[PDB]
């Protein structure tokens, strides 16, 4: 140990990341007609505990019928999962929602379902995210959206109100404009712009207010005479290849897994 420490017994890796593949394949038997020594061990000892488990004679499983391995985070979370949804009531108004891993913030004012679950499987996250948002209802409604990084000015969260920000400021942080008639959906990438090294969901109050946020999104409508239908917005997030995940946590207990029950 370079830290000036010494020991007589060893120190092996405990709970090592990505140990085996997630699809049945051959990376004979898997164990058999020999003697299952891995049927007994002293779990308290980290070394011994890694001894491969084996109890009876088995054969090699074989090959899975499907191409890709569904257990590769990149591919799994590659399926843009649900994030949140809101609805505009008056014209020339705006909504601003934060992207917060916080296990504390319960939906709708917080991370829901899968996304909630996923982001609490590990301690640190960093890297871009591909947000995609679906428009529901209205038509011929001009709209705009911008990504605001943690620690900067931005209209009050989880609240529909008249923007209090200079058009200049908004556009300046990089923004996008669209119209319900011509589209009905937007898929744009959110940058890893933060003064932190990474963000986390599992935290306590204080840090849970600064270090638990990727950033924020703000959507502002225009030309929406409410003589028209209603205007709904739904947001979904998908992890990118440039996204990283460090240190595995114990998954959230079921009682804390919540979902925004609707339809």
């Amino acid at each position: 140990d370079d830290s000036g420490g010494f020991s007589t017994t060893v120190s092996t890796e405990q709970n090592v990341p990505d140990p085996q593949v997630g699809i049945t394949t051959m990376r004979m038997d898997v164990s058999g007609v020999q003697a299952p020594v891995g049927a007994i061990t002293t779990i308290e000892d980290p070394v011994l505990a890694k001894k491969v488990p084996e109890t009876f004679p088995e054969l090699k499983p074989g090959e899975s019928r499907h191409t890709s391995d569904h257990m590769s985070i990149y591919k799994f979370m590659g399926r843009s999962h649900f994030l949140c949804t809101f609805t505009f009531n008056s014209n020339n108004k705006e909504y601003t929602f934060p992207i917060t891993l916080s296990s504390t913030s319960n939906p709708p004012h917080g991370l829901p379902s899968t996304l909630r679950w996923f982001f609490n499987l590990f301690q640190l996250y960093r890297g871009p995210l591909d947000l995609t948002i679906i428009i529901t209802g209205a038509t011929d409604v001009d709209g705009m959206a911008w990504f605001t990084p943690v620690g900067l000015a931005v209209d009050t969260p989880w609240v529909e109100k008249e923007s209090a920000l200079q058009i200049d400021y908004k556009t300046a942080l990089g923004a996008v404009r669209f119209n319900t008639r011509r589209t009905g959906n937007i898929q744009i990438r959110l940058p890893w712009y933060s003064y932190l090294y990474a963000v986390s969901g599992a935290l306590d109050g204080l840090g849970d207010k600064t270090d638990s946020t990727f950033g924020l999104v703000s959507i502002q409508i225009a030309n929406y005479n409410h003589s028209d239908e209603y205007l709904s917005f739904s947001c979904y997030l998908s992890v990118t290849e440039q996204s990283e995940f460090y240190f595995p946590r114990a998954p959230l207990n079921s009682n804390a897994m919540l979902s925004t029950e609707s339809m």
């Binding site: 049945t24 002293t42 488990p53 499907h66 569904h70 257990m71």
Partner: protein
């Protein structure tokens, strides 16, 4: 952990691994027989003599010892390539199963001991899997299986 992951998949297959950790004292003595009965998640099994159980694959463990945990690697045995997460459905349907059978803990040799030590011995059961495979993403927060 095992659960929290698989709960987000429709299908799964592989060797589930039950680890039994005993918390005795160098003064107790006993044996427990762990028995896997191949089938589905709902098979009346209370009508099974210990003797009867030795027909199914199983293992016995001497508690009193320098070691503490017996590992039960339950081989993937099924009539289907994968089992499904029916724990989302309203009721149950003959054939749509989540498990490949049930595990049973029998008393092989009664627990002996003096009198200045507990009248029993607790046991922890960990669970993990090897050669695990899950596919077909879905969302569901598995509840507790109240035995």
């Amino acid at each position: 952990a095992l659960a929290s992951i698989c709960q987000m998949f429709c299908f799964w297959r592989g060797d589930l691994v039950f680890d039994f950790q005993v918390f005795p004292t160098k003064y107790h003595s006993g044996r427990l027989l762990f028995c896997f009965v191949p089938g589905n998640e709902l098979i009346d099994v209370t009508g099974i003599t210990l003797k009867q159980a030795t027909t199914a694959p199983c293992a016995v463990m001497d508690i009193a010892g320098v070691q503490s945990t017996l590992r039960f690697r339950v081989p993937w045995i099924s009539d289907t390539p994968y089992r499904v997460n029916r724990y989302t459905k309203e009721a149950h349907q003959k054939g749509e199963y989540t498990a490949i059978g049930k595990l049973i803990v029998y008393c092989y040799n009664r627990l002996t001991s003096p009198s200045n030590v507990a009248h029993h011995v607790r046991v922890n059961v960990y669970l993990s899997a090897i050669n695990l495979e899950c596919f077909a993403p879905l969302y569901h927060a598995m509840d507790v299986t109240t035995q």
